[PDB]
Write a protein that holds these residues in place. Structure first.
Motif, mmCIF file in Angstrom:
data_model
loop_
_atom_site.group_PDB
_atom_site.id
_atom_site.type_symbol
_atom_site.label_atom_id
_atom_site.label_comp_id
_atom_site.label_asym_id
_atom_site.label_seq_id
_atom_site.Cartn_x
_atom_site.Cartn_y
_atom_site.Cartn_z
ATOM 1 N N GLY A 190 91.613 -78.487 2.707
ATOM 2 C CA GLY A 190 90.810 -79.646 2.354
ATOM 3 C C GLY A 190 91.679 -80.754 1.804
ATOM 4 N N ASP A 198 95.118 -92.729 5.471
ATOM 5 C CA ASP A 198 95.354 -91.620 6.380
ATOM 6 C C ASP A 198 94.676 -91.893 7.710
ATOM 7 O OD1 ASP A 198 96.698 -89.629 4.628
ATOM 8 O OD2 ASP A 198 94.835 -89.866 3.475
ATOM 9 N N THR A 241 93.801 -88.807 -5.520
ATOM 10 C CA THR A 241 93.607 -89.127 -6.932
ATOM 11 C C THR A 241 92.451 -90.102 -7.120
ATOM 12 O OG1 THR A 241 95.958 -88.737 -7.290
ATOM 13 C CG2 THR A 241 94.791 -89.967 -8.994
HETATM 14 N N1 LIG Z 1 94.545 -85.644 -6.101
HETATM 15 C C1 LIG Z 1 94.186 -84.579 -5.303
HETATM 16 C C2 LIG Z 1 93.109 -83.768 -5.690
HETATM 17 C C3 LIG Z 1 92.743 -82.661 -4.948
HETATM 18 C C4 LIG Z 1 93.435 -82.336 -3.804
HETATM 19 C C5 LIG Z 1 94.498 -83.118 -3.384
HETATM 20 C C6 LIG Z 1 94.886 -84.244 -4.117
HETATM 21 C C7 LIG Z 1 96.017 -85.082 -3.619
HETATM 22 O O1 LIG Z 1 96.785 -84.734 -2.751
HETATM 23 O O2 LIG Z 1 96.086 -86.325 -4.223
HETATM 24 P P1 LIG Z 1 97.225 -87.496 -4.054
HETATM 25 O O3 LIG Z 1 96.607 -88.753 -4.525
HETATM 26 O O4 LIG Z 1 98.522 -87.040 -4.729
HETATM 27 O O5 LIG Z 1 97.508 -87.582 -2.506
HETATM 28 C C8 LIG Z 1 96.448 -87.874 -1.582
HETATM 29 C C9 LIG Z 1 97.041 -87.933 -0.200
HETATM 30 O O6 LIG Z 1 97.644 -86.664 0.134
HETATM 31 C C10 LIG Z 1 97.430 -86.372 1.504
HETATM 32 N N2 LIG Z 1 96.629 -85.158 1.601
HETATM 33 C C11 LIG Z 1 96.079 -84.434 0.577
HETATM 34 N N3 LIG Z 1 95.474 -83.336 0.962
HETATM 35 C C12 LIG Z 1 95.636 -83.340 2.340
HETATM 36 C C13 LIG Z 1 95.248 -82.431 3.342
HETATM 37 N N4 LIG Z 1 94.621 -81.276 3.094
HETATM 38 N N5 LIG Z 1 95.558 -82.739 4.621
HETATM 39 C C14 LIG Z 1 96.224 -83.872 4.869
HETATM 40 N N6 LIG Z 1 96.657 -84.793 4.005
HETATM 41 C C15 LIG Z 1 96.333 -84.465 2.749
HETATM 42 C C16 LIG Z 1 96.765 -87.602 2.125
HETATM 43 O O7 LIG Z 1 97.781 -88.464 2.618
HETATM 44 C C17 LIG Z 1 96.041 -88.191 0.917
HETATM 45 O O8 LIG Z 1 95.785 -89.585 1.045
#
Ligand SMILES: Nc1ccccc1C(=O)OP(=O)(O)OC[C@H]1O[C@@H](n2cnc3c(N)ncnc32)[C@H](O)[C@@H]1O
Length: 394
Positions: A295, A377, A299
């Protein structure tokens, strides 16, 4: 709307106070033990901080970190948890961006300096189960029956998450409960007593939800570890703690392959976030009888908002929007994409959406334009409505 306090709201949730909430260094703390300590610590923080004052916590995962965070919220302060191993300039930049009044650091850490430098306090050496962070000596012992919660509009900022020049995402009582309900209740259906283990730390929004909030929110308990997660240490924790729910990322699952038998001893719900879970990883673990649910969270959206559902996960897929969320794909002219198999930039709205950045230019805030968060994304949707990550826009 009624004025409320996030810590007070979590404390009122109907779960047995004698059940575990956090585990640390072979020890366990109950809901009641943490609530008592949080209120005591709040009585001390109220002597130091006025409502609204920001606090930066540069600490390793521990029950004292989690409780200090909630004690800050209890008094109306606005905490943020960052990498304890941040370089000095990075910590200074974050403290300056949110104009922090207080920074709490690891033992022996240097003091912050420069314009409007915050007060620096340090955790105790020896990694105690519960730390006073020098508050006993600074402001005196705690009050015995404190309950002077600072109550505010549920939409107002009550903590920050920092993911160029640092940007602090504001989270409110309302959207925090929103992201918890959508993920912990609706997607995962966490049960009281469930033992949770998040390898990612609380300075990552993923880990903050997994380890800090979901235990309070769902009546579960989380293993907290202040050491880095080498595969050797992860294995030690698996064997010692035997979690039912594991929160990982794709490379972690790759690293756990040699220990599949030990992981399968206790893990019944395996989640992966952060980047796309490769088909090869999904299929290796399926062959051992373990479904890994991929999933995406961000942030700016609080937590996971689009994911494979337990029991119905598929390889090479990010799944479906969580209940309450709406996802949309836009082409390079901003037009909504209805067709399957056509990639576009993913926008999302729903319960976990942040009200905005703490300090930002108009252009930075434009990521929230129109009540949606623009993820940056690239995604495509298939005929079943499921999403697959395709890269980043440019
Ligand atoms: N903050 C969070 C809370 C819960 C779960 C993850 C996060 C988290 O990752 O927060 P961030 O703000 O550091 O980064 C967000 C960005 O990461 C990438 N991404 C995250 N999960 C996936 C995935 N499963 N498949 C593909 N891309 C994914 C994507 O580019 C997104 O925009």
């Amino acid at each position: 709307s009624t004025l409320a306090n996030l810590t007070e709201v979590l404390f009122r949730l109907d779960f047995d106070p004698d059940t575990a909430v956090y585990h640390y260094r072979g020890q366990t703390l109950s809901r009641l033990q943490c609530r008592t300590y949080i209120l005591s610590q709040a009585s001390q923080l109220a002597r130091l901080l006025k409502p609204g004052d920001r606090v930066v916590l540069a600490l390793n995962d521990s029950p004292s970190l989690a409780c200090l965070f909630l004690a800050c919220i209890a008094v109306g302060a606005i905490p943020a948890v960052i990498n304890p191993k941040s370089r000095e300039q990075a910590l200074a930049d974050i403290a300056a961006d949110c104009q922090a009044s207080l920074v709490v650091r690891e033992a022996d850490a240097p003091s912050l300096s420069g314009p409007l430098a915050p007060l620096t306090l340090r955790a105790a050496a020896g990694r105690p189960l519960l730390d006073d962070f020098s508050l006993d000596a600074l402001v005196g012992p705690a009050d015995l029956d404190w309950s002077a919660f600072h109550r505010q509009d549920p939409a107002a900022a009550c903590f920050l998450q920092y993911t160029g020049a640092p940007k602090g995402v504001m989270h409110s009582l309302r959207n925090t409960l929103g992201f918890c309900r959508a993920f912990a209740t609706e997607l995962l259906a966490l049960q009281a007593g469930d033992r949770l283990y998040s390898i990612p730390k609380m300075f990552f929004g993923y880990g903050m939800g997994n380890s800090l909030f979901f235990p309070w929110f769902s009546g579960a308990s989380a293993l907290l570890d202040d050491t880095w997660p080498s595969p050797e240490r992860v294995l030690e924790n698996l064997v010692a703690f035997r979690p039912r729910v594991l929160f990982g990322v794709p490379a972690i699952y790759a690293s756990l392959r040699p220990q599949a038998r030990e992981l399968l001893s206790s893990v019944r719900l395996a989640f992966s976030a952060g980047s796309p879970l490769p088909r090869g990883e999904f299929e290796f673990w399926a062959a051992h009888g373990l479904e890994i649910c991929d999933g995406i969270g961000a942030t700016e959206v609080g937590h996971v908002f689009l994911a494979n559902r337990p029991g119905q996960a598929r390889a090479d897929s990010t799944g479906l929007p969580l209940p309450g969320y709406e996802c949309r794909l836009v082409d390079r002219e901003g037009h909504t994409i209805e067709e399957a198999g056509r990639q576009g930039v993913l926008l999302v709205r729903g319960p976990g959406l942040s009200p905005g950045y703490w300090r930002a230019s108009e252009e930075q805030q434009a990521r929230f334009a129109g009540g949606w968060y623009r993820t940056g994304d690239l995604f495509e949707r298939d005929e079943s409505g499921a999403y697959r990550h395709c890269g980043r826009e440019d």
